[PDB]
Amino acid sequence: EFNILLATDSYKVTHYKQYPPNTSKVYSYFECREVKYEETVFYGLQYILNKYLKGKVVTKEKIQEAKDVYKEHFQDDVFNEKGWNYILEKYDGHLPIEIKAVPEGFVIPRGNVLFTVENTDPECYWLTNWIETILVQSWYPITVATNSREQKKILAKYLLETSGNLDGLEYKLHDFGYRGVSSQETAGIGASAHLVNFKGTDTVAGLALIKKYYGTKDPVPGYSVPAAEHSTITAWGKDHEKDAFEHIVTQFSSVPVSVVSDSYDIYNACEKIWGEDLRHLIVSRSTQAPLIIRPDSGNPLDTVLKVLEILGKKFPVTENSKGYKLLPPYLRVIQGDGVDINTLQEIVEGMKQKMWSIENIAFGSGGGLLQKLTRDLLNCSFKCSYVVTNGLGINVFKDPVADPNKRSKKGRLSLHRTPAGNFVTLEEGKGDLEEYGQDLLHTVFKNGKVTKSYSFDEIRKNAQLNI
Amino acid sequence: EFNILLATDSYKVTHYKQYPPNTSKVYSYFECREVKYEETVFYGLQYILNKYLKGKVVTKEKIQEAKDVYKEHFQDDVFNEKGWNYILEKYDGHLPIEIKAVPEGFVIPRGNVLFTVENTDPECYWLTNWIETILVQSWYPITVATNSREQKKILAKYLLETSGNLDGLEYKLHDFGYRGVSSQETAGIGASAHLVNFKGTDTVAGLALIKKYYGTKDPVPGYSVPAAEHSTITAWGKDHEKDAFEHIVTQFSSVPVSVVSDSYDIYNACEKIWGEDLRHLIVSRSTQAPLIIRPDSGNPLDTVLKVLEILGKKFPVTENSKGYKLLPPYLRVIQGDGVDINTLQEIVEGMKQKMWSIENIAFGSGGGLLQKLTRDLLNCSFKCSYVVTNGLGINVFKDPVADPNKRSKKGRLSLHRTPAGNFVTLEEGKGDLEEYGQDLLHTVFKNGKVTKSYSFDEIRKNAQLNI
Ligand SMILES: NC(=O)c1ccc[n+]([C@@H]2O[C@H](COP(=O)(O)O)[C@@H](O)[C@H]2O)c1
Ligand SMILES: NC(=O)c1ccc[n+]([C@@H]2O[C@H](COP(=O)(O)O)[C@@H](O)[C@H]2O)c1
Ligand SMILES: [Mg+2]
Ligand SMILES: [Mg+2]
Numbered sequence: 054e055f056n057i058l059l060a061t062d063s064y065k066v067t068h069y070k071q072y073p074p075n076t077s078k079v080y081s082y083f084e085c086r087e088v089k090y091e092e093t094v095f096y097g098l099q100y101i102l103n104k105y106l107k108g109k110v111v112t113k114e115k116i117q118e119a120k121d122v123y124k125e126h127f128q129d130d131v132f133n134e135k136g137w138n139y140i141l142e143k144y145d146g147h148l149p150i151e152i153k154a155v156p157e158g159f160v161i162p163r164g165n166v167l168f169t170v171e172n173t174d175p176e177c178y179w180l181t182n183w184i185e186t187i188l189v190q191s192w193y194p195i196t197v198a199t200n201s202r203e204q205k206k207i208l209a210k211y212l213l214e215t216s217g218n219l220d221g222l223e224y225k226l227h228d229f230g231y232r233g234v235s236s237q238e239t240a241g242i243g244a245s246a247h248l249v250n251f252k253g254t255d256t257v258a259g260l261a262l263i264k265k266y267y268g269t270k271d272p273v274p275g276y277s278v279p280a281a282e283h284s285t286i287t288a289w290g291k292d293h294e295k296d297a298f299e300h301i302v303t304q305f306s307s308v309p310v311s312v313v314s315d316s317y318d319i320y321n322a323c324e325k326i327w328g329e330d331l332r333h334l335i336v337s338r339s340t341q342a343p344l345i346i347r348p349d350s351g352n353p354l355d356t357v358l359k360v361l362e363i364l365g366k367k368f369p370v371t372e373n374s375k376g377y378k379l380l381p382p383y384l385r386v387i388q389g390d391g392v393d394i395n396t397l398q399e400i401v402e403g404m405k406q407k408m409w410s411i412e413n414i415a416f417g418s419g420g421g422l423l424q425k426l427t428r429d430l431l432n433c434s435f436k437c438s439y440v441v442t443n444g445l446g447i448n449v450f451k452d453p454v455a456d457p458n459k460r461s462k463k464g465r466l467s468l469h470r471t472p473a474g475n476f477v478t479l480e481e482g483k484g485d486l487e488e489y490g491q492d493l494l495h496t497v498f499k500n501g502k503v504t505k506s507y508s509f510d511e512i513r514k515n516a517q518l519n520i
Numbered sequence: 521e522f523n524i525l526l527a528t529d530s531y532k533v534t535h536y537k538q539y540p541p542n543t544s545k546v547y548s549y550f551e552c553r554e555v556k557y558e559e560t561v562f563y564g565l566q567y568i569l570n571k572y573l574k575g576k577v578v579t580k581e582k583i584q585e586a587k588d589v590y591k592e593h594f595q596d597d598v599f600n601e602k603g604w605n606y607i608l609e610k611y612d613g614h615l616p617i618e619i620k621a622v623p624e625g626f627v628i629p630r631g632n633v634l635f636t637v638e639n640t641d642p643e644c645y646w647l648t649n650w651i652e653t654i655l656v657q658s659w660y661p662i663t664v665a666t667n668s669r670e671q672k673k674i675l676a677k678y679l680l681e682t683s684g685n686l687d688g689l690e691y692k693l694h695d696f697g698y699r700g701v702s703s704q705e706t707a708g709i710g711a712s713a714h715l716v717n718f719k720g721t722d723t724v725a726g727l728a729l730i731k732k733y734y735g736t737k738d739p740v741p742g743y744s745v746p747a748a749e750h751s752t753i754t755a756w757g758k759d760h761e762k763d764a765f766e767h768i769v770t771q772f773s774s775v776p777v778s779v780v781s782d783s784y785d786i787y788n789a790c791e792k793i794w795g796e797d798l799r800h801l802i803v804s805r806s807t808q809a810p811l812i813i814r815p816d817s818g819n820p821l822d823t824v825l826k827v828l829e830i831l832g833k834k835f836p837v838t839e840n841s842k843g844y845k846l847l848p849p850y851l852r853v854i855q856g857d858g859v860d861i862n863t864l865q866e867i868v869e870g871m872k873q874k875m876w877s878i879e880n881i882a883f884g885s886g887g888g889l890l891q892k893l894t895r896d897l898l899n900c901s902f903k904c905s906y907v908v909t910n911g912l913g914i915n916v917f918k919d920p921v922a923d924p925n926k927r928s929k930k931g932r933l934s935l936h937r938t939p940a941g942n943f944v945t946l947e948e949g950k951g952d953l954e955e956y957g958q959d960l961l962h963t964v965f966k967n968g969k970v971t972k973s974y975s976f977d978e979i980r981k982n983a984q985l986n987i
């Protein structure tokens with residue numbers, strides 16, 4: 054059983070003794086610190102609110118467990134047993150906190166307030182930043198969703214140029230990252246963030262998370278197809294690669310099937326096995342059931358270009374209405390090795406330069422999609438901007454001399470539309486002047502209850518590309 | 521609840537139709553592919569065995585749930601209901617799998633077998649690689665534990681050179697990574713891996729994981745100290761930083777206390793506030809209860825060196841028996857911003873060149889320690905090396921033409937010590953010739969039971985530095 058009293062940074066256990074005496078309010082906010090990378094997708098807070106913060110999260114047993122752990126961990130009694138007991142007794146263990154947030158799926162530039170946190174009881178001034186640690190982990194679904202959407206922008210640009218439309222876009226970047234993330238929980242969170250933008254995934258854990266915490270009208274939010282791995286090819290023995298291919302495509306004769314083709318020599322597999330020995334099993338397939346050839350090694354760009362040149366000389370190629378080469382509809386390629394946002398851009402640009410339509414290719418990405426990301430990418434940060442001490446509110450901030458980029462915002466914050474329709478964050482309570490219309494943040498959590506929520510279908514609509 | 525039938529890569533759902541007919545055994549192994557590092561710490565498999573693989577993991581409801589999800593996810597009935605129901609009925613839902621592994625905490629060069637997996641019932645040839653995805657996530661605790669031990673080696677070298685001993689080494693690298701990892705589950709796994717090498721942590725989640733899955737004779741495996749954050753300084757107001765510092769060191773007058781000092785001007789704080797205004801509260805403190813000044817911004821090397829120069833001109837400095845400068849015992853520094861293995865090395869080398877002992881400094885590291893790591897760092901990989909088809913064993917492997925570094929090992933594997941005391945992995949069942957002493961792999965899981973377990977104390981002993 055998760056215990057929120059044990060789900061903070063150790064030093065926060067000692068902070069209730071450090072704030073100014075007679076502090077009744079601590080007010081804090083989360084942002085992606087401003088370096089015009091540009092526009093982030095806000096996603097993932099609703100998971101945290103429901104799984105970890107709502108309802109009766111304090112019990113007498115959890116207080117005693119934490120007391121006993123911290124006594125040994127600090128070799129001292131610093132733990133605030135009385136403060137936690139107050140929440141248990143006064144509010145039946147429900148947190149006296151209010152969180153306001155931008156709607157999930159919203160696409161918003163860096164440097165803006167995304168959510169704010171404050172205590173609703175003066176006795177609980179210390180609780181606001183107790184829960185910093187758990188809320189800051191929202192950096193991860195934000196960053197996965199944002200980086201996935203930035204890859205969708207690249208794919209959309211090159212698909213539109215080379216084909217004239219966006220058909221199939223939502224299946225062009227497939228999540229391969231289940232083995233390459235750091236835990237089962239991370240797999241579900243990260244896969245769900247990718248599914249904000251795309252529909253193809255092998256990280257099954259994302260499906261149940263979406264169903265439980267967000268919801269979709271469709272039975273499931275993402276889809277897959279049968280596909281080989283090296284064990285199912287190499288198990289046949291090195292002299293029997295053709296037999297493995299023949300068996301697999303015949304077992305999956307009326308659905309799309311991906312077949313990894315590089316166990317021994319990708320180029321021989323394409324030109325001689327697929328292109329000659331088994332060609333009669335490929336040209337017979339349906340447009341709804343292509344063979345998808347999967348290289349999985351070598352320089353990603355060089356390998357894709359050579360595979361395409363090989364297949365173009367063994368299969369009938371057409372020229373689409375934009376002038377780009379197109380494999381027949383029963384044959385496609387997926388590159389799933391070494392894919393991240395940089396190599397994805399390299400490959401589609403290299404294909405365009407060689408006059409190959411992006412219709413021909415799809416991508417799989419594991420670590421690059423779900424693991425090779427840190428809180429530094431969008432520079433996600435949670436800071437106190439306002440306190441009330443001795444009944445007087447003061448605007449507070451940090452401004453380190455050697456790094457102006459760690460300067461934080463001052464006072465009570467609100468998010469507004471500008472006259473040109475862009476976003477602005479107002480500081481120092483200036484939203485109250487109503488010169489910029491109403492605050493766009495909404496109360497999503499108050500006093501142990503989730504007060505506003507979004508379906509996964511809503512989030513996908515909010516996160517759409519402009520195109 | 522967790523459902524192992526939904527905890528695999530989607531394509532593995534389809535692999536039972538792809539292996540050669542008449543296959544009764546699939547045998548697979550895990551390694552860190554050869555060389556770039558040398559030596560890895562094997563850690564974290566026992567967590568996975570106990571949390572996810574042992575006991576009754578198949579039920580009628582879980583089979584039906586997976587059947588329903590996969591029907592929608594694939595738009596097709598491909599799920600192996602018969603094969604999963606076989607495990608349910610014959611084995612009461614216990615997995616007929618045997619896993620053999622090197623003892624946890626063992627320090628092993630790259631390119632060696634670390635564990636193997638095989639099915640114990642011919643009907644379950646498909647189950648070996650079903651569980652690849654969950655087992656390969658062991659890359660994360662292995663990589664955290666290894667990267668943390670490599671930092672410990674750097675610290676030990678420089679501490680020995682500048683002071684003559686290793687006193688305090690185990691508290692020199694403190695885990696700050698709770699907010700910077702991707703999930704609660706990752707936090708506990710990663711923090712527990714760092715504690716293989718060190719004893720200081722703020723990532724509380726690691727403590728409960730170790731207690732539940734490994735065990736220590738001590739009450740807790742890691743420890744912390746009171747410390748400020750920017751909210752507990754800046755809440756006092758920009759003009760009252762000195763009041764915040766004075767309150768905090770007085771509240772924690774008899775334990776070590778870390779006080780972040782860079783809210784507005786780290787160099788003013790050190791020279792004028794600590795070095796003059798509050799100096800009388802510092803020079804009175806015990807050797808067991810120093811003030812630890814914490815910069816948190818700017819260039820990490822330049823900032824540490826300038827802080828040390830400032831403090832050495834305001835406080836009495838000694839020269840130790842190695843010739844290096846030493847602050848008084850009541851005053852220390854912790855650098856917890858921008859710390860990874862590369863900047864840690866930069867800082868201790870820069871200190872040595874300026875004749876400062878590493879006794880003066882400690883480090884905190886969050887993302888660099890627990891999040892900025894991928895499966896590519898040690899190149900962790902799980903592959904099939906042996907199968908039995910029509911009662912004949914065959915040695916199988918991949919060997920892609922464009923990347924010899926993706927070549928996998930052949931046949932039945934074993935791990936041995938060499939005559940010179942190093943390690944060798946024997947292939948093709950050659951361990952059976954018994955020219956090389958006992959196999960170092962031990963059965964840790966068989967038919968749903970954990971058969972061999974290690975305490976956290978044993979793991980720490982196995983992972984000790986040579987020195
Ligand atoms: N359906 C699939 O083909 C599938 C699914 C999951 C992982 N994979 C593997 O994932 C690897 C890529 O992972 P990384 O992006 O983490 O390096 C590929 O080499 C690929 O073989 C493939
Ligand atoms: N006890 C502490 O001082 C403590 C604990 C946890 C995090 N932190 C913060 O962790 C940050 C470092 O995080 P990253 O290494 O992920 O960038 C520091 O800037 C530091 O303020 C400090
Ligand atoms: Mg692969
Ligand atoms: Mg790989």
Ligand SMILES: [Mg+2]
Binds near residue numbers: 816
């Ligand atoms: Mg900081």
Ligand SMILES: [Mg+2]
């Ligand atoms: Mg930071």
